[PDB]
């Protein structure tokens, strides 16, 4: 039996995140340092009170 | 065991004795003769003076400079002479520089400016807090955190703000603006000890903010915009100086509010808020279009 879970964003799972980033970096012309910043900028974190 | 219970009925008498004692203090007191009370320690806070005379400045030890050796030779333009091994600041130079500063505090408060009274010393907390209430300004009675002006984005990040109007009442509709807006900076800093906190004053110079300070005989006068040559080590002189400046702001805030009830705003919208206006209609322009 299958319990496929549909994810809204690709950052909520480590498996899907490392595979997407790997396909992007497979190109010889891929800007490594730039593709990582594009992903982090898409990762929204909730505001918090440090104290 | 009554020896331990005899303290209860004594406590039950405190309300009665206090009431009767207070009543007795109203009749008999002041019977003998009338006293000419011409000085109370806490008079610069309960009712600070509108202006300071040569006698008020001298009575408050505002002319006591530091030792002759511990002096900044640049600030010798205000020294009257030497006596008791100290430099005597000219009383007339202090009154003139004080009135001029009181004019700056009034105009800045009259134009809707944000003032910041800064006194950082053991007993300068009640003085600065009182002056801020009169002028409707902000106070600071602790060590100035370096970077609160040049690095306000981080320090004053979570502190809440509000948007007001002519009559200083909140305006609903700027919620989205109070999250992208960057923190505020004082339009006029009134320091009561420029010798101690030079990190605050330098930031104001870097940030193009006017400043007012009490320049003692050993303080560098080039640190503030408007100097008030006087004794900053005397807690009685600081209360008078700050008291006069507090009344100035109060008198300025009154004119501003009196002019707003007549539909005469004495200030235009700040540049940051002004920008958020044209963008607001820009977003609404799409509604009319689509």
């Amino acid at each position: 039996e299958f319990n496929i879970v549909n994810m809204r964003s690709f950052l909520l799972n480590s498996d899907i995140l490392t595979k997407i980033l790997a396909l992007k970096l497979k190109n010889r012309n891929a800007r490594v340092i730039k593709i990582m910043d594009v992903i982090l900028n898409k990762a929204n974190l909730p505001k918090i009170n440090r104290v | 065991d009554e020896e331990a219970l005899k303290l209860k009925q004594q406590i039950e008498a405190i309300p009665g004795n206090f009431k009767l004692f207070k009543q007795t203090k109203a009749q008999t007191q002041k019977l003998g003769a009338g006293v000419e009370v011409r000085y109370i320690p806490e008079q610069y806070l309960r009712n600070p003076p509108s202006d300071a005379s040569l006698e008020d400045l001298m009575a408050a030890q505002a002319h006591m400079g530091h030792n002759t050796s511990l002096w900044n030779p640049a600030n010798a333009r205000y020294i009257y002479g030497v006596r008791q091994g100290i430099h005597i600041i000219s009383l007339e130079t202090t009154a003139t520089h004080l009135r001029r500063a009181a004019r700056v505090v009034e105009e800045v408060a009259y134009r809707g400016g944000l003032i910041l009274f800064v006194g950082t010393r053991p007993g300068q907390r009640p003085i600065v807090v009182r002056a801020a209430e009169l002028a409707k300004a902000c106070h600071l009675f602790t060590k100035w955190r370096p970077g609160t002006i040049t690095n306000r984005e981080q320090l004053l990040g979570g502190v809440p703000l509000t948007v007001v109007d002519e009559l200083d009442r909140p305006l609903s509709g700027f919620e989205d603006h109070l999250h992208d807006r960057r923190p505020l900076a004082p339009d006029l800093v009134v320091c009561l000890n420029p010798k101690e906190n030079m990190t605050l004053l330098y930031e104001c110079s870097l940030a193009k903010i006017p400043t007012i300070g009490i320049i003692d005989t050993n303080t560098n006068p080039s640190w503030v915009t408007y100097q008030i040559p006087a004794n900053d080590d005397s807690l009685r002189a600081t209360a008078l100086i700050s008291g006069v400046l507090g009344r100035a702001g109060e008198r300025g805030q009154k004119r501003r509010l009196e002019a707003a009830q007549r539909g005469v705003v004495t200030w235009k919208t700040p540049a940051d808020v002004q920008g958020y206006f044209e963008l607001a209609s820009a977003r609404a322009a799409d509604a009319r279009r689509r």
């Binding site: 340092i33 | 992208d180 540049a271």
Partner: protein, 95 residues
């Protein structure tokens, strides 16, 4: 308008208070690019120090300096640090 989705100009958009489309209309240029090195307990640490000038072209100019381990991060720092340090430069007859 999708111009700045990296979040780099957002903070600068608050200090300067002007659209992102206008920040790109400025004349920026990387003048100096040094390769400094610092000896530490873990060996040399080589950094790039870059100075960038930002100018409007009609009497405004700003100088910004920054450094980082990556030559790209250093140029972005000076760019934003140079656009917020702009000052009006007086000029006779605008020439």
């Amino acid at each position: 308008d999708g111009l700045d989705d990296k979040g780099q100009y957002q903070e600068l958009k608050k200090r300067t208070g002007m659209s992102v489309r206008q920040i790109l209309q400025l004349k920026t240029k990387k003048l100096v690019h040094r390769r400094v090195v610092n000896q530490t307990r873990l060996g040399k640490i080589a950094s790039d120090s870059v100075m960038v000038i930002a100018g409007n072209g009609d009497g405004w100019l700003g100088l910004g300096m920054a450094k980082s381990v990556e030559a790209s991060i250093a140029v972005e720092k000076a760019t934003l640090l140079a656009i917020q340090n702009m000052q009006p430069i007086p000029r006779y007859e605008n020439r």
